[PDB]
Design a protein around this ligand. Sequence first.
Ligand SMILES: Cc1cn([C@H]2C[C@H](OP(=O)(O)O)[C@@H](COP(=O)(O)O)O2)c(=O)[nH]c1=O
Ligand SMILES: [Ca+2]
Length: 129
Amino acid sequence: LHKEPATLIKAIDGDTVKLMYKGQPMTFRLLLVDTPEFNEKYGPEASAFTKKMVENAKKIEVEFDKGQRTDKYGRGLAYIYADGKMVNEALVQQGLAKVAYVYKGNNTHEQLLRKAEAQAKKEKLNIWS
Ligand SMILES: Cc1cn([C@H]2C[C@H](OP(=O)(O)O)[C@@H](COP(=O)(O)O)O2)c(=O)[nH]c1=O
Ligand SMILES: [Ca+2]
């Protein structure tokens, strides 16, 4: 897998963000994770967490996996990095997302994310509290 550049257009919620990629606006859904909706418990905290992380980054990157790059709603499916740090992983470490939506062929960073989730659960952070 390889990282590619992108620029923030707008934060949307915990696990979706609008980015400019190859010069085009696109909504990105984070691979392998699930944040609560904004109207659900820990949803506002998830949206805040992602928003802060993407807005403060000097460098946003996109990393596609080996399978489909777009979901059925036209959202790109990627791992997103903020100054070298994976937002998908950071959310899970904080107990602000669960590992979810693990489909075959787009699951390269599954076991990395599971390990973060196990550490979040041990700490009884946020979603695990
Ligand atoms: C994360 C992800 C979600 N999706 C689809 C499955 C879910 O379908 P349904 O909408 O039919 O429930 C939906 C969950 O996304 P959200 O958690 O943003 O709603 O997005 C994919 O198809 N591939 C993925 O990798
Ligand atoms: Ca969600």
